[PDB]
Amino acid sequence: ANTLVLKPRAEQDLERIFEYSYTEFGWQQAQQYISDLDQTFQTLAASTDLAINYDHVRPGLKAFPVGAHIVFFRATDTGIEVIRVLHQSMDYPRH
Amino acid sequence: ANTLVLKPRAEQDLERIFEYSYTEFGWQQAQQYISDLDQTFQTLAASTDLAINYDHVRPGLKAFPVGAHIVFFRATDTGIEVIRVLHQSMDYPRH
Amino acid sequence: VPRGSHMSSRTMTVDTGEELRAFVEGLVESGDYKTNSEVIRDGLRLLQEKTAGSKLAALRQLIDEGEQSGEAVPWDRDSFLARMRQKGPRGG
Amino acid sequence: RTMTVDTGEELRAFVEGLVESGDYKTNSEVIRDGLRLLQEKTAGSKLAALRQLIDEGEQSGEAVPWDRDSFLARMRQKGP
């Protein structure tokens, strides 16, 4: 099993994303959204080739979209380490 | 009877003020607010001494407060002519 | 709130359109702002700032637009309120 | 998709005046103008802003294993 760890601030991002979705749409949608994020985390932990190279932001940083959000993470020896999960409006794609 | 006339734009101001109040507060309050503006108009048409001199905006312009609004008007030979009714946030008081 | 009194908090429901809605959402979710309201207030402060130095010109322009809007006509409160009732069903 | 916001009294009155003057059609138009200015303020520095958010993530502490069950339990526990 590939490893999957989150920085504390990434977990707090997930809480805010959950709360935002919950306020608007209710429990079922918010839980679904986190489930989609979770499924994506598992896929990224398994497949190095999916990760988008985000060196132009910080060397070794990777990004991947899910829904209206972006997972920003780094590869580790055994999986990934998620640094932030941000809304796509915060993105800066490579020039 | 002292004269009371309104520029077309002042009537349109009153419609917008009425609609704004109506959305927020409903019929009874919005109609009352217009009635209070009407009572003020009648008082100003009767008493020249109430008018606040607003020459610093335009020569001959007068102002008077009612509620959260300001009646901007000119004195005529026989009463007043209301030019605009604006929210007090738009005021530029004399320095 | 003390008994026999009521809350006087006053909100507004606004349509920002999708582009600016997503902009607000991202700012709240990043933790940069605590609520949608805080984001909207920052925007309104910038809008108030942009025009704060030209209040005299702005008021002159509104007065002039009144002066130029046509000849003044008699005012009748009851006719106005009848006209307001005629625009559609009214309640409260 | 609308949002309900509390602008506070000072800015609420600011918005009302702009709508009642006829300068803007609705409260929404006023709010959108404000948000455009806020978006404009930061539009030129999106890379620095993202770098700051990433750095704040990096500096937020040691990463811990992701535990979806614990997360959802915590969400349920807040305001069940």
Residue numbers in the entry:
A (entry chain A), B (entry chain C): 4 to 98
C (entry chain B): -5 to 86
D (entry chain D): 4 to 83
Paper text:
Recently, PrpTA was found to be a pMBL6842-encoded type II TAS with the unique function to regulate the plasmid replication in Pseudoalteromonas rubra. It consists of stable PrpT toxin and labile PrpA antitoxin canonically positioned adjacently within the same operon. In this study, we reported for the first time the high-resolution structure of the PrpT:PrpA2:PrpT heterotetramer and two forms of crystal structures of truncated antitoxin-PrpA2–54. In addition, PrpA could also competitively bind to the iteron sequences in the ori, interfering with the binding of replication initiator RepB to the ori site, thus preventing the overreplication of the plasmid.
Overall with the crystal structure of the PrpTA complex, it was certain that the PrpTA biological assembly unit indicated with PrpT:PrpA2:PrpT contains two PrpT monomers, which were isolated from each other, and a PrpA homodimer. In other words, PrpT:PrpA2:PrpT heterotetramer is maintained by one single PrpAFL homodimer interface formed by N-terminal PrpARHH domains and two PrpT-PrpAFL heterodimer interfaces, which is similar to its structurally relevant complex, such as CvParDE, and consistent with the conclusion that PrpA dimer interface and PrpT-PrpA heterodimer interface with an estimated CSS (Complex Formation Significance Score, calculated by PISA server) value of 1 contribute to PrpTA heterotetramer complexation. PrpT toxin starts from a RHH fragment in the N-terminus, helices of which are connected by a single glycine residue, and the β1 tends to be packed with the EF-P OB-like fold that is mainly composed of C-terminal 3-stranded antiparallel β sheet (β3–β5), as shown in Figure 1Bb. PrpAFL begins with an extended conformation (β1) spanning from 5 to 9 aa, followed by the α 1 helix (11–23 aa) and the α 2 helix (30–45 aa). The C-terminal PrpT neutralizing domain (49–85 aa), which is also the tetramerization domain, is connected with the C-terminus of the α 2 helix by a hinge region composed of AGS triad [Figure 2B (upper)]. That is, the PrpT binding could result in the dramatic flexibility-to-stability transition of PrpACTD, which provokes the de-tetramerization of PrpAFL antitoxin and the rotation of PrpACTD by ∼80° around the AGS residue triad, further leading to the extra interaction between toxin PrpT and RHH domains of PrpA homodimer. PrpT:PrpA2:PrpT heterotetramer is formed via a local twofold axis and highlights two extremely similar PrpT-PrpAFL contact interfaces. PrpA and PrpT interact via two hydrophobic subdomains surrounded by electrostatic interactions. The heterodimer interface dominated by a series of salt bridges/hydrogen bonds covers a surface of ∼2000 Å2 with an estimated ΔG value of −17 kcal/mol.
